[PDB]
């Protein structure tokens, strides 16, 4: 029940850096892979199981769960992420595509997170964010604005990032505390890295302006 770090270290160069991190037990399993036809067959069986669950998923109240489990299974079994046999990106695609018109998941942050995992593999992410906005997906969530704004900021487009933040503020995206800190911090970075482009009032100083005349 306790995975030793020595065992994880044996596999360290197959571990994809991921914001969400990795499951310990999954890493234990990675370090012990024997790469035999049998092992591959076991994985093929489990995949089949997940695919059958997707088949029957409509009956369930919360069918997204089935995808989450499946996505997790992929992330867990392929610590390096996308490979031909992992099919990670394709799975993320099918999942994002599945729920687009579904009202139940519009504001569900799990679904949005799946979208954010997908966007890492996209050539032009701006089309993806625009897509979500157009479909009113994640618009009430701080994470959407964080990622959209981040794309712009990474590109160096601070003003564009601010516009995204403004929409979120009007949106009152939640949790509003997280959003507040994220926006604040961004503004800080904008003032540090590109002051000349900061478009909002700074109440800046005016050296030697006349504040009083006797007459």
């Amino acid at each position: 029940n306790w995975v030793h770090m020595d065992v994880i270290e044996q596999s360290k160069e197959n571990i994809e850096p991921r914001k969400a991190g990795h499951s310990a037990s999954a890493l234990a399993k990675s370090s012990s892979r024997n790469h035999t036809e049998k092992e591959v067959a076991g994985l093929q069986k489990e995949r089949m199981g997940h695919e059958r669950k997707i088949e029957t998923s409509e009956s369930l109240d919360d069918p997204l769960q089935v995808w989450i489990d499946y996505i997790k299974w992929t992330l867990d079994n392929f610590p390096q992420g996308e490979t031909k046999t992992s099919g990670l990106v394709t799975l993320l695609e099918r999942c994002t595509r599945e729920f687009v018109r579904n009202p139940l998941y519009k504001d569900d942050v799990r679904y949005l997170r799946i979208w954010m995992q997908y966007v890492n593999y996209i050539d032009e992410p701006v089309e993806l964010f625009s897509f979500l906005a157009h479909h009113h997906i994640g618009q009430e969530s701080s994470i959407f604005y964080e990622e959209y704004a981040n794309y712009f900021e990474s590109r160096g487009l601070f003003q564009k990032a601010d516009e995204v933040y403004q929409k979120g503020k009007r949106m009152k995206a939640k949790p509003f505390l997280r959003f507040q800190q994220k926006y604040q911090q961004f503004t800080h970075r904008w003032l540090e890295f590109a002051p000349q482009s900061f478009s909002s009032n700074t109440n800046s100083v005016n050296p030697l302006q006349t504040t009083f005349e006797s007459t």
């Binding site: 044996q10 360290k12 160069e13 024997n34 790469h35 390096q80 490979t83």
Partner: protein, 326 residues
């Protein structure tokens, strides 16, 4: 239960806001590589001086003749195991194949028959380097074995320089020195006659799979580090000095010196999956060419014997050929 649980009553201080040469990007040729294993700890590609490419797909080694384009299946392992490494001998006559079970097979390329199997490793042999008739094998155990391939009792020595998997292994072309990198983040530089490391370098902060001797300068060695490192360091193997360094930006999976020009190529894993060509000088390294090579990490690479073409392979199941010189 003799235990009483206590918590420091005082709240921790809240954090304060802080004050502070055109290169063709299209490969000339692409060959399907179905079933290729994605693992940083394996080396599944090599290109012989007889112009034969060997590539490991799961249990099998396939050989491709770059001239005739004839394909053939050279080897199939027992189902309890898989191929962890392939390396051609310098003359290109023999193919050594390291296995997941620690065995090392030697095949004759002409008749495609297995000449011999060499035991004595306790775990996967992931890297191989030939010095003349001596074959050296590195393993997940951290051991290195020297085999004299001509003799019945093959092993002529062992080096233990690594407390975990031996990842990189290369003999100098003149056989005077051997370099090994490891999953313990260590580079070892060994004189041929000595089981004592000449130098031990700890500068890398991650595994060192990528190890290459400079063909135009005897003592010049390049090593490159994995995901938490991303650096390529250069060493004078006589004095132990670090003579150069560069930040590669990604996990370094291989380093290949250009024979015809003063340049070095690197292949990369996380995040970039790219191929880079750097100009080399005493003053430093300048990035010349940077191109995404594969849709996954470029884990395997080998240079053509004429030095004009680099083959790369990945788990996108493409074996790609890039014209690097000319």
């Amino acid at each position: 239960l003799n235990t009483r649980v206590l918590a420091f009553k005082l709240d921790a201080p809240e954090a304060k806001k802080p004050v502070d040469r055109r290169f063709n990007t299209t490969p000339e040729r692409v060959l399907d590589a179905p079933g290729i294993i994605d693992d940083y700890y394996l080396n599944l590609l090599d290109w012989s001086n007889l112009n034969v490419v060997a590539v490991a797909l799961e249990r099998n080694v396939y050989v491709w003749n770059a001239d005739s384009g004839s394909v053939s299946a050279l080897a199939e392992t027992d189902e309890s195991t898989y191929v962890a490494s392939v390396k051609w001998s310098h003359d290109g006559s023999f193919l050594s194949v390291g296995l997941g079970n620690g065995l090392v097979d030697i095949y004759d390329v002409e008749s495609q028959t297995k000449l011999r199997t060499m035991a004595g490793h306790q775990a996967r042999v992931g890297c191989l380097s030939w010095n003349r008739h001596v074959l050296s094998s590195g393993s997940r155990s951290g051991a290195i074995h020297h085999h004299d391939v001509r003799i019945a009792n093959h092993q002529i020595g062992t080096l233990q320089g690594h407390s975990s998997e031996v990842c990189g292994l290369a003999w100098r072309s003149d056989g005077l020195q051997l370099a090994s990198g490891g999953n313990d983040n260590v580079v070892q530089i060994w004189d041929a006659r000595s089981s004592i490391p000449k130098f031990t370098k700890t500068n890398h902060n991650a595994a060192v799979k990528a190890v290459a001797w400079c063909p135009w300068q005897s003592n010049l060695l390049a090593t490159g580090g994995g995901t938490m490192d991303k650096q390529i360091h250069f060493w004078n193997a006589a004095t132990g000095a670090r003579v150069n360094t560069v930040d590669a930006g990604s996990q370094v999976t291989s380093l290949i010196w250009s024979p015809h020009s003063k340049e070095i190529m690197s292949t990369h894993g996380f995040p970039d999956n790219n191929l880079s060509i750097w100009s080399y000088s005493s003053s430093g390294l300048t990035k010349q060419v940077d191109i995404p090579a594969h849709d996954t990490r470029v884990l395997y690479s080998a240079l053509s014997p004429d030095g004009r073409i680099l083959s790369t392979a990945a788990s996108d199941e493409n074996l790609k050929f890039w014209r690097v010189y000319d």
